[PDB]
Amino acid sequence: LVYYEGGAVCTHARSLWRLEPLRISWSGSHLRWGQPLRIRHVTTGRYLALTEDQGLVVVDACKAHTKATSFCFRVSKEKLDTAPKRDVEGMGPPEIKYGESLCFVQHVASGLWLTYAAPDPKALRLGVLKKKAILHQEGHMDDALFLTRCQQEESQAARMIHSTAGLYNQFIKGLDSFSGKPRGSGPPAGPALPIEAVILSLQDLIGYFEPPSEELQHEEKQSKLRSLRNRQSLFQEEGMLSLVLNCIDRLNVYTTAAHFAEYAGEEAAESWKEIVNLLYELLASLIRGNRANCALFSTNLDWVVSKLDRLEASSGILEVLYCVLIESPEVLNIIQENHIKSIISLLDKHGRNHKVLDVLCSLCVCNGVAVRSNQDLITENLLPGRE
Amino acid sequence: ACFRMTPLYNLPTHRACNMFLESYKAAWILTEDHSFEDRMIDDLSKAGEQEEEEEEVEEKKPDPLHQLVLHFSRTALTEKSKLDEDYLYMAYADIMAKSCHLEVEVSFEEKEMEKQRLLYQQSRLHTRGAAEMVLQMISACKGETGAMVSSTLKLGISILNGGNAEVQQKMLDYLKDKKEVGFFQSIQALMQTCSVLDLNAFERQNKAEGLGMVNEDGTVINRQNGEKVMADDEFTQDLFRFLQLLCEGHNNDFQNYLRTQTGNTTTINIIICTVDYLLRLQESISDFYWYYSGKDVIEEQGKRNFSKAMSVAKQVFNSLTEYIQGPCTGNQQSLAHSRLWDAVVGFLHVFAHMMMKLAQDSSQIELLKELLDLQ
Amino acid sequence: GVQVETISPGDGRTFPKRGQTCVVHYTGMLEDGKKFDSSRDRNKPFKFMLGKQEVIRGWEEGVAQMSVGQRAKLTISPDYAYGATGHPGIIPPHATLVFDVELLKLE
Amino acid sequence: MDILELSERLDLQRFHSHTLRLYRAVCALGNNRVAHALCSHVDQAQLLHALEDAHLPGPLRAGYYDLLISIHLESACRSRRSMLSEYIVPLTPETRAITLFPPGRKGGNARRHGLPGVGVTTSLRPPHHFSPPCFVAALPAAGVAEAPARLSPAIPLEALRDKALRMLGEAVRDGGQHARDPVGGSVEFQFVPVLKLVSTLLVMGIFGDEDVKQILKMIEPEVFTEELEEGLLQMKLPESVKLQMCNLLEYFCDQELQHRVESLAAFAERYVDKLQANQRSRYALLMRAFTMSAAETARRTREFRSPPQEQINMLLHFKDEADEEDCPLPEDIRQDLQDFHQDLLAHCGIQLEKKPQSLQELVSHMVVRWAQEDYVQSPELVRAMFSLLHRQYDGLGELLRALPRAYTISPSSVEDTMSLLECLGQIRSLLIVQMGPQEENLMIQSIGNIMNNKVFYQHPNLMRALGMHETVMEVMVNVLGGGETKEIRFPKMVTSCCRFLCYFCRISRQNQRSMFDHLSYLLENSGIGLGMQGSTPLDVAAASVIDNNELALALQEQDLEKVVSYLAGCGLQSCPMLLAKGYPDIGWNPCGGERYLDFLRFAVFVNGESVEENANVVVRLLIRKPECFGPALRGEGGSGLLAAIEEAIRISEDPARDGPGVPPEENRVHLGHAIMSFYAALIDLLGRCAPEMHLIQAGKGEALRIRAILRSLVPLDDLVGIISLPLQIPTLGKDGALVQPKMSASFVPDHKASMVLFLDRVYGIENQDFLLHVLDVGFLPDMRAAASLDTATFSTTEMALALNRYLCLAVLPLITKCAP
């Protein structure tokens, strides 16, 4: 469904759209009033379309058939459509400007005009900023739409989110297929998982989210930090974080690569550990330095602590927890004795690591504020034993 | 009440001492003038022994003033949700702004000499990144009015006074190479915040002054509150004077940059924003004139409020004039297609009627003169 | 309870009386052998008046049996001592306490 | 092992350093209990040995230094630094002796500065408090959060300071030798810890005059000689060491400023004594010479007629010498002030050799030379050095900014002022840490102690200078923000935070204005207050606005719009705690609506008169959002106000509608009472918004419009019906056991009083027939009821008292008005 909305959605990716002219050649030509085209949602990959059953919607490419998905930009609602323009080679005249032209979107076949539905009862009571978009014969003055540029970084991020979501959902589906089915003394007999693609995507995304070097000059480093924060926020809003968590859970159900192999096979078992480590690293990269993304774990902190004992990705899980604790006071407030004891047990079981001490230190104080309960719990649990 | 007003000798000692503290502070310390800005700037500008090393010429290490400018630019560039107030930045910006200007017939020789001295004093700053720091702080404020942005604007005006082409070029080059929308977004937000005459606030202040209740502490008759009507007039004049100075000298490049920013993903038209503020001010002035229309004689507070409004409108007119002068044809066309005509119509109406009214009473001659100069 | 074993003898004639301040040096160890307190490290003798309840029962009764110049080892069960609640950070719950106490003087 | 083996054993070194870091974290920010616990794991002997140990690695050395500071010194230094900004100077002979410059041959203006940090300081700083570390002590039986807060562990300060001086001197001497085996492996690891300890001790006030002199000589002997070895400033140092030097110089500049303030206070004492004597003599002269000339005599008396502050200002207004003659004071008294002013200007350096010869010159040259010698890579050091430079260049402005925080008190008030200072120190400490039950008990105890203290009443300007109300607001709002959405934490502490702020506004207008300035922010946090029982930030705002026409007129629109939006939301949905408790679901929240309505009442109506400026706006906003009016008065499909009251009475009678009907507090909400109170408050607000008679008479169109709008909203018949509505009355039955109505669940006379006010201000009573109608229907029955209740059993009943108040307040005055 399509809505008019205001707020952070303007910064977000899901408000992004791509214009695709029908002609393949010179598709990058200057847009022209009355030019038929298709409107694609970058992240989902879906195309704006008119469907008899649900009117204005976004549909898949397979369903798109150039009559539902064909739209044109019109300077004025008055419609003559006496002569269709001829196909033109080259870039052509620069008719439509960014941020200046007022454009009405018209569905070519029906001739209907894109417009807001108008509030349904109790919507005005809520005051919600969402106004469903419809195709209507008359519409209103206000229907005119400005077109605004999108940064290359953000467009690339939207496309990357589309591809990553598709790949990771396919991977999750492959896992769920044999979740409860042991292959036995035989193959799993299901579609091969995309292990190499997942590994490469994780590596590329980690490099994508890598923080700027400390040796870097201050202004450039600040610019990189901004870009990184915006990119983290976009991925989070489109839900890649939750997808990573789901993949991690599906992989965690299996204790070891052999236990994984009994369900998926050795050829995936070798990459199991690499994939879990890469997933934890990607999670840490996404949430590192991001207050909101680190705060999200207030709802599920047990998700991180429960997994600390696991050997395969101990360091990655610990880094994730360290990032969360440095960033989010909320987590500190919701800490409990069970979590503190689990971390102390991590010291006992995995040896003397100063990173655990740094985690404990972060628990005590955040941004000039001390948590007395956490301080006292750490003291009472760790110190008196003296071992 | 006066009988109860005790002679100070009856007053307890500690209360009297505190009263003496406030009185001495106001009468003596504030009245005392001490100028350390020029000396401080010279001391910081001087770099010592670098010629003695003779490698410092190849190295070009910053001088102390350059380092301070770099520190403030670092603070501005630092990524933050909000710009925290820095009394240090405020004080140092005041010091530099003072140093630059450091201000009945004058010879051409003399005028040229003062121009040259001001250019040197401005060079002390803009050779050391002061212009870039000013732009960075305006971008950092993100449209929130404050003492920080006031000091930044004052510094910019101080370095730009006389239409310094070199400062203009530095600012424009920095903006074009950075390609950041935050600067003009902040300017637009600041204009939107800039206030106009409010008849309700004027009436409330009049009621308060009329009451003039005695304060329980001591006695304060007719107590006065901070000016409600157009309190940010100094900030408004500073902002529009900064914008004017940027285009001063018929700098077509910066004029066209204000109209549109080609490289940037989004564009803001400062000329149209100025026109909108002028229209709002004109509406306020028209309403306030209507309020005083039946009344035979405007009172003193009304005269002061008119004077503030007309000074602001004068600065706005000068800024628009400076945008279009040179001439800049694009700015001319934009204004021709803007609402400036409606603003001029309202201003002419107010001018005519207030002229006729003010002519009637001689005490209103100064306000009439200001009105005529505004026309 | 309190078990007292003489490390070094005292005078054998002077014993603390109620309302009489006892000045001591002590070194505090848990039964495992870990030291948690010592007045000698601070270099300042610890003074406590008998019968106020400033110190734990173990100290009260054990010093009651001691004499001037006497050095003794006092073993105090948790019941005498801080007990199940313990002394957070310092002493675990249900910890027997071993003290090396020298009764320097009475005042 | 020997801990020195960690030089080669690096992993253990990192682990132990981070262990010390953890110790510091757990004892951080006032956890004195944890500090006492840590005293066992790391003892005083260990810490001192580490301080003196040359062979330790730098991480461990610095960690042990910082651990010592955290356990023993950090909290004390924090409290002292918090107090240092203020300058409360008692009037004593010690204060009197203070002079800008120290006695000598040279003239005060040209006469050489005294050494910083040396002399007499009379400003009040609360003493430090420490507790010995003992682990054999009896465990308090009292439960946690009730026991008094533990003090920081004790450390022998005289030994520590002597040791710090000796170690700093040895470090200076060895740095002079430029040896290749520095303590900690670096000049930084050597110098930084000692300097931090010394600065902490200075701020804490441990060092005396002679040791301050020793430190000053270590810094620079030539400048600080009083009437070879190389000083730290000349040594050549890394940036961190320079930063510690900057902190020390900061302290000494603070001391110079404090000395200036104290000297000014002493001069004020002496000068005020002289001026008071002279003024007394002059008024004796006047009382003798009134016979000579009446007019000039009266003109001179005008002085004594002026308030004392004006008299002082007039007497001091003789600087320009143009107003010299008008000032009555003699030339000698004037000259004393002139000489003091010149001496103060000289002290600040305003009056204008290579060798510095002064702290200001030393600091300025040192900063400039550092910047010239190297491009500083530490922004913290850059900020510190340039800030200190600014102070040296403009001391006088620094004094100007410090003066508002200077206050003079009699020595008699010293003990109470110190108690207040302690309480304020605890409150300030509470800011940094997250709130818990113990911190709440402490905050409440401190607030109660402050209220008990007289200085809180006698010296409100001192409280405003101290910024104590702002601290209370910050604590309150942090607690409201924490768990804001889910449910309100520490309602008791928030209630105390009003009682304090709300009383503080009551004390003085200037306090009320100061809280008015933050009004909006209080209103931003108010949203939860509707659910909140007891005092709330909305009540704080009401105190800020109450009975001050100036503040009411200064009040800005957007605040009223925000209140009206909250009120609408109350009219639109129900509160989620009543549903959680099981209360029957309804559309709207009458309780929160009532809260916002009485706030608007206090805003609009002041001292017996309506403020039309706010009232007209309130009416416009309410008509724009008619949900505030209630589901009754809705318009389409809306039951009238009288029917709403009747339905509320039926609900009150019927349980499962008043409440869940499945209360230790007994304040449990009763829906009928809540609805009736909401409507009564709305009617009262509208009647108060109603224009005044004299405006009506003048014929002002806006006033007529407002009255017509109010009349359209509320018809007269509904008001008369509500006034006629019966009120339950106490009776005796079944052995005479008093059957007495429950007020919180029943219709009450105040509900009728609101309607009476509306009728008087809006509709009025002009005709005998209507007056008689009202009397027969509603008033006379209630008066008869009150009189009948005027018996021994019933006289003190709550209903009888309510009826008497309702009558005297609303009805009887109206009958007196309509008597003709």
Residue numbers in the entry:
A (entry chain B): 244 to 630
B (entry chain B): 3634 to 3736, 3749 to 4020
C (entry chain F): 1 to 107
D (entry chain B): 1648 to 1874, 1922 to 2046, 2088 to 2397, 2410 to 2567
What do the authors report?
pmcRyanodine receptors (RyRs) are intracellular calcium channels involved in the excitation–contraction coupling in muscle cells and in calcium signaling in neurons and other cell types. Caffeine, a xanthine derivative found in plants, has been used for decades as a pharmacologic research tool for activating RyRs, and its functional and binding properties have been extensively described. Here, using cryo-EM, we explore multiple xanthine derivatives and related compounds and identify 4-oxopyrimidine/2-pyridone as the minimal motif necessary for binding to the xanthine/caffeine binding site in RyRs.
To determine the minimal motif necessary for binding to the xanthine/caffeine binding site and how different substitutions affect the coordination mode, we resolved the cryo-EM structure of RyR1 in the presence of different xanthine derivates. We found a clear cryo-EM density in the xanthine/caffeine site for pentoxifylline, dyphylline, IBMX, and enprofylline, while we found no density for xanthosine. We were able to model the most likely position of the xanthine derivates thanks to the clear additional densities from the substituent groups and found the xanthine scaffold in a similar orientation in all four samples, stacked on RyR1–Trp4716. Second, we found that RyR1–Tyr5014 was not engaged when N1 was methylated or substituted (IBMX and pentoxifylline) but it was engaged when N1 was unmodified or protonated (enprofylline).
